[PDB]
Design a protein around this nucleic acid. Structure first.
Lengths: 77, 80, 67, 393, 203
RNA sequence: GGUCUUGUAGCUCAGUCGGUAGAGCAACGGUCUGAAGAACCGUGUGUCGGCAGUUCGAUUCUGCCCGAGACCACCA
RNA sequence: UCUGAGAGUUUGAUCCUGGCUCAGGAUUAACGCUGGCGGCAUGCCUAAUACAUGCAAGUCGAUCGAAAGUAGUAAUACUUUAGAGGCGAACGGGUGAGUAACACGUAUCCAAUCUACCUUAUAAUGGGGGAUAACUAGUUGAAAGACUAGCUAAUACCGCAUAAGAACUUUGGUUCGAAUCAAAGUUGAAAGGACCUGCAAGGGUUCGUUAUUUGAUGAGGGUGCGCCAUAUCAGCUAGUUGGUGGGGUAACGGCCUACCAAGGCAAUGACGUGUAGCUAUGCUGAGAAGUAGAAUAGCCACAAUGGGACUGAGACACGGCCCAUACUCCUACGGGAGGCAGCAGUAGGGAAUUUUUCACAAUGAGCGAAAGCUUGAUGGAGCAAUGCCGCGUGAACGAUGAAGGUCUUUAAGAUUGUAAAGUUCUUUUAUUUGGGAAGAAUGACUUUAGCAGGUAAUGGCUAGAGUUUGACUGUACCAUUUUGAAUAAGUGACGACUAACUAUGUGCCAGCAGUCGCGGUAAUACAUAGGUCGCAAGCGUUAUCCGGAUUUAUUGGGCGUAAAGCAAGCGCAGGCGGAUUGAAAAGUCUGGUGUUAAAGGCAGCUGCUUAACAGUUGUAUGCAUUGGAAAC
């Protein structure tokens, strides 16, 4: 038994809960962008996504791909 | 170290901790054998420069060897 | 040790068979027997004959002849 | 690891003589419970010594064992010697391991012929001034029947050569002592003070090489094979080399660890009840009741000459003479080795008694030394008695 | 085997003489009866080229009295060097420590040289020898280990000792050296390297 | 070490509850045959694994021992 | 420049073909007999069977509240931490079950990729919010623990803003599928701990901070190839194939999704099926190669079975988690707890494959200012004649030769046999004695001397002075340190093969035997004995591979009567192709360059008391690239 097993098991639950909660706080913005398209919501989505893209919660390169997709489809309209 | 039993030998190498000892060597910087504690170390003397300039700290014994040569007071200006 | 049942020659002089005794074996083709190429290490197990095996007990192991 | 002791309470080996239904299990529990208060760490077992079927249920002892119990002044190991005829060898080994003991003779279940033979063998092997306790004085508290029990106990002791007129027989009953009555708890104190004299302290010595009498054979989970017994003589430690001798070729082995009752000990010396985990041995190769030795020690002997006094029927021996081709069993503290009574010339049919110089060959070579006092039995009864006089092999 | 035991039990069969005459002679009568009573009249039982190769092996090997493991090992080592392997080997086969000590005029027998080297009474270049299997090269010093000079055998041998033409000593200091590389003529011509070197089919 | 089986000839087996030790073969000799096989047979072959009681010599009525062998012996 | 062993055997004999057998090397080797010692390397293949225990991952309090303790009346100071936070946790260790494939490599494309730390370089190290851990109180269960309510720390967590430079948008220019640049837009950065210098204000030391820029590092994917047996394995693939779009990966990808369609794989072998860790390598060979892919190494797979998720730079992680399964254990019978293919150790197996060992002295690791910490990795010690090696078991002398085993079938004499008794002589080991290294020209520790940006202090760096931490060590080793042949030889064979004879007994009985063969009546053979011989602290045999066997033939074959020409013809694919002229140079030779790690191959050298082994340098092969030739 590694000494840092039960301690990290108790600790990582906070990180998991924080990541899970923060992901949907951006998912709601993304769904709002689905509901109606405008530059203001694009800016809000980028502002909310730059938090999680900074860390490993949302893959930074995946965040870049998704933001490029959103700005490209918005440029269509 | 690596060598014959009852014959303490530790050849100088720039190995990474991700690779175990006796595994694959990245760059063997000459060799060392503590079987004679007057002079038994040899190195290339060229790897030190940019193999220090690009980080990736090798085995800690390189510092004591640098002491025998005083490499810092000729490398700090190049460093900064 | 496997489930095979194999015929073999009884090597060495004398006999100490007990009808399901344990025997330590050896190979060895012998032409007086058609196709038999097996034998026994007669001398180190429950079968102990080999009286006066005083020329070669590297085969048919026994105590060293007292001189 | 297994909870290393720090041996600081000196050891004396103690035992029991008699039969069950004397309260034997209750006496074994009571001695430890009583001495636990006046002396720290006197572990007790009443049914916890029992570990097997027909020892759980029936309660008799078939594989005799030991109980440890210590005081603030001395430590003691009590051998659970049985009656139960055809178990006599199990008692002999106890008497083979024995320096002091408590003669268990109750005021209700008094001496029977089995206890008669027990005391006969105890005297014959040689026990120093054995201590006696009179049991079962709570139920059927008598005035002359108790005198009867005491008088016949003393008479039986004298019949073997003891000073029975001076042997201490402490009255009382340990059943009420364990029950909680101090009137009978103090009788155990009287018994142990009577034990303090005539039950000597074994001399733990360093000059003798080694000697071990096997009581059982043991195997641990994940560790190997343990052989347990009593270290009669010799010093020992972990890592030494010991040879198995007798009934097997003399085979060398390395000791892995010295213990006493499943837990490792400081160091093994003369008179120590201990055990040893061994390196590269088999529980089948070792046998319960085998002698041990170290290289460069006393040689094992098959045939030797001695002076033997046979057992008269007048004192509980043979009722007929024995032959030369007669095949009784000898005993060297561990085994019933069989050897024909090769009586000297002109003597083939010899009656009981009549201490005579005779020579005997054994089926197995056992280490014999002069001055060693042993017994001879066959047919379930003791037939001969003597001590080694000369070794010829 | 590590030793030889009886000596002329091999001289009888091999026609052997290290003193070149006196390893079979002047012991009542120089007799040519082979070991054992079975010497009625023999020319060849299986005596042949392979048999004389075995004989020459047992002669050269036992005229130094060495084992087969060392001899095979040294041949395997010579296989790692170049030139005429037979003559280089024979020079090396003559160039170790005990043969030199015998040829210095210091050892009555090579067995005595082996015993003295075993006893630690030989010193080479200020290095105490416990095994005479060194292969020597020009420029080595062999001395007496003066603390052992009390031996009368070494005293008797050293004075009138035979010094080989290629290693030279002084008895005033009891010290000598491997001066040069020897030539074939100094050794008997009865031996031929061809027998042993073509005899090598094991390796 | 106790719960129990078992050791009968050279081998395998029979042997009223105490009166007695034998079959088949291994195997010696005869019949034998031009020689050899076949062959009919007469053997020898045991106090019944060894000891202690009982009495009518005890495998026999029991018990003890040696050894092998179906259960229990750090072992929850 | 480079290397080569044979033999018998068909029959009446012989010539030819031909298999077979043997003489030889190597093994996780065991076993058989026997066995002194050291150096040296390895040491469970079987049941990838279960496995008490320890240890295999801990560390940081100079990251933090707070807890307890001691010196102090206190003030506090100091030690550790119940815990939080950070770091490493994925390094490492061991088993190859599995997988016949981009697995191992090889050469390469990653315009298709990222990369905690660490390097270079640029900008600062703000203000707030909310807290809870810890704790307090309690129930319940044996614990596994959970919940009911309060209470506080951090660099724990999260808004706001500044955001050079970035990233993503719009637009402009810019060069050969990519990419730089000009402007704006969207949006994104943290942190304090200890401390010097300061009356203070502040400046700052030092560790770090964030967005950054450079690297390397490692990871991953792909390509061409190479490496099993197998067609008495011919159809196979329905996300399979292609196209469109979308979702998901560090990167691109039917990776996936829905739609539109039927394509894709293979007779020059899709696949069917048995087996398999691959490679470097080890044995044999002269070679290509056969052998096994021991031990280690490179890489890769997995962790009781099958899935799945968290966190983290990456894990579904041997020793983290949930579920289900199977085992086991505990149990309060309701429910919980464990994964040595981590080392040793045990039980089963096998014929068997080391100890439940010491030290973290040294290497190495991280965690840490540092101190210090652990480290079944590592160095060791021990077991095994596991393998090799070194090394003894006495030296010389001693005669016509003691006795005696044998013989000549007795009385000679010979052999044993210089064998012996014996003259001394002696010790590497052994045996008492004392000394005695190195490994620690490691690392930090403290001051001293000096250097530098910076001054007002420091701190960073370099040299000398001392302390050191030695597991092994009592090591190696040695002075007549005392004594001493004392402490030690077996094994197998003696008919030809393939070196090694006599006697007795035996009569195809016993048994020996790879061959012939020996004993139904004088056995070289069989049993034993003497003699002889051969290897030796090992000897022999077992079993596998290789050589011999060039005996499926590149080296290294034939197809008439010993196997082998089809029954013949037609003849596809295909193999093989007249002469001369030209081109390129694909193949080929060839020079240079990069790579095929290292170990190991080879030569020299060095420590190996001599070698084994290890180290020094040089040291090929194949592939790709480039400069030459047209001989083919």
């Amino acid at each position: 038994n590694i000494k840092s097993n039960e301690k990290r098991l108790r600790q990582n639950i906070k990180r998991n809960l924080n990541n899970k909660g923060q992901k949907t706080k951006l998912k709601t913005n993304v769904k709002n962008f689905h509901k109606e398209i405008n530059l203001d919501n694009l800016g809000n989505v980028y502002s909310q996504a730059d938090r999680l893209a900074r860390k490993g919660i949302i893959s930074t390169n995946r965040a870049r791909r998704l933001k490029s997709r959103n700005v490209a489809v918005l440029n269509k309209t | 170290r690596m060598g014959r039993v009852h014959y303490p030998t530790y050849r100088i190498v720039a190995v990474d901790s991700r690779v175990k000892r006796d595994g694959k060597y990245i760059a063997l910087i000459g060799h060392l054998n503590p079987a004679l504690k007057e002079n038994k170390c040899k190195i290339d003397e060229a790897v030190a420069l940019e193999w220090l300039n690009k980080g990736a700290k090798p085995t800690d014994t390189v510092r004591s060897l640098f002491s025998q040569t005083g490499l810092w007071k000729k490398f700090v200006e190049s460093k900064k | 040790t496997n489930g095979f049942e194999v015929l073999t020659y009884i090597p060495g002089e004398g006999h100490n068979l007990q009808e399901h005794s344990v025997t330590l074996l050896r190979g060895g083709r012998v032409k007086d027997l058609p196709g038999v190429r097996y034998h026994i290490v007669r001398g180190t197990l429950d079968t102990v004959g080999v009286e006066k095996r005083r020329q070669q007990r590297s085969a048919y192991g026994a105590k060293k002849p007292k001189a | 690891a297994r909870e290393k002791f720090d041996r600081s309470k000196p050891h004396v080996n103690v035992g029991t003589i008699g039969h069950i239904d004397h309260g034997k299990t209750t006496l074994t529990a009571a001695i430890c419970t009583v001495l636990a208060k006046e002396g720290k760490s006197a572990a007790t077992r009443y049914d916890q010594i029992d570990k097997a079927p027909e020892e759980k249920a029936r309660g008799i002892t078939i594989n005799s064992a030991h109980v440890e119990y210590s005081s603030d002044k001395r430590h003691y190991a009590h051998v659970d010697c049985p009656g139960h005829a055809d178990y006599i060898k199990n008692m002999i080994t106890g008497a083979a391991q024995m320096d002091g003991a408590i003669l268990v003779v109750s005021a209700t279940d008094s001496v029977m012929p089995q206890t008669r033979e027990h005391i006969l063998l105890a005297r014959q092997v040689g026990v120093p001034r054995m201590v006696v306790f009179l049991n079962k004085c709570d139920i059927a508290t008598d005035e002359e029947v108790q005198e009867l029990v005491a008088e016949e106990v003393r008479d039986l002791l004298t019949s073997y050569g003891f000073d029975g007129k001076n042997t201490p027989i402490i009255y009382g009953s340990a059943l009420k002592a364990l029950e909680g009555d101090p009137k009978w708890e103090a009788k155990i104190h009287d018994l142990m003070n009577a034990v303090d004299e005539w039950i000597p302290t074994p001399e733990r010595e360093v000059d003798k090489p080694f000697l071990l009498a096997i009581e059982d054979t043991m195997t641990i989970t994940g560790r190997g094979t343990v052989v347990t017994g009593r270290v009669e003589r010799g010093e020992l430690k972990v890592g030494q080399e010991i040879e198995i001798v007798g009934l097997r070729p003399i085979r060398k082995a390395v000791v892995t660890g010295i213990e006493m009752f499943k837990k490792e000990l400081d160091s093994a010396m003369a008179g120590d009840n201990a055990g040893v985990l061994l390196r590269g041995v088999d529980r089948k190769e070792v046998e319960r009741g085998q002698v041990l030795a170290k290289p460069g020690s006393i040689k094992p002997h098959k045939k030797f000459k001695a002076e033997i006094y046979a057992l008269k029927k007048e004192e509980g021996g043979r009722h007929t003479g024995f032959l030369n081709g007669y095949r009784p069993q000898f005993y060297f503290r561990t085994t019933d080795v069989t050897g024909s009574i090769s009586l000297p010339e002109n003597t083939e049919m010899v009656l009981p008694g009549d201490n005579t110089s005779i020579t005997v060959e054994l089926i197995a070579p056992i280490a014999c030394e002069k001055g060693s006092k042993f017994s001879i039995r066959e047919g379930g009864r003791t037939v001969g008695a003597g001590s080694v006089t000369e070794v010829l092999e | 085997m590590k030793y030889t035991g009886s000596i002329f039990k091999r001289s009888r069969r091999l026609g052997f003489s290290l003193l070149e005459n006196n390893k079979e002679f002047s012991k009542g009568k120089k007799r040519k009866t082979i070991p054992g009573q079975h010497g009625n009249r023999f020319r060849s039982s299986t005596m042949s080229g392979y048999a004389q190769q075995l004989q020459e092996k047992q002669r050269m090997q036992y005229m130094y009295g060495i084992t087969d493991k060392q001899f095979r090992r040294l041949f395997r080592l010579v296989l790692k060097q170049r030139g005429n392997l037979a003559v280089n080997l024979f020079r090396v086969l003559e160039s170790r420590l005990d043969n030199i000590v015998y040829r210095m005029g210091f050892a009555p027998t090579r067995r005595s040289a082996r015993q003295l080297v075993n006893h630690g009474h030989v010193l080479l270049n200020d290095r105490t020898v416990d095994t005479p299997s060194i292969i020597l090269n020009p420029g080595d010093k062999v001395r007496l280990k003066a603390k052992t000079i009390k031996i009368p055998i070494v005293k008797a041998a050293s004075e009138s000792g035979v010094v080989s033409p290629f290693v030279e000593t002084n008895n005033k200091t009891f010290e000598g050296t491997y001066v040069r590389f020897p030539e074939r003529s100094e050794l008997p011509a009865g031996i031929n390297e061809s027998y042993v070197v073509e005899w090598y089919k094991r390796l």
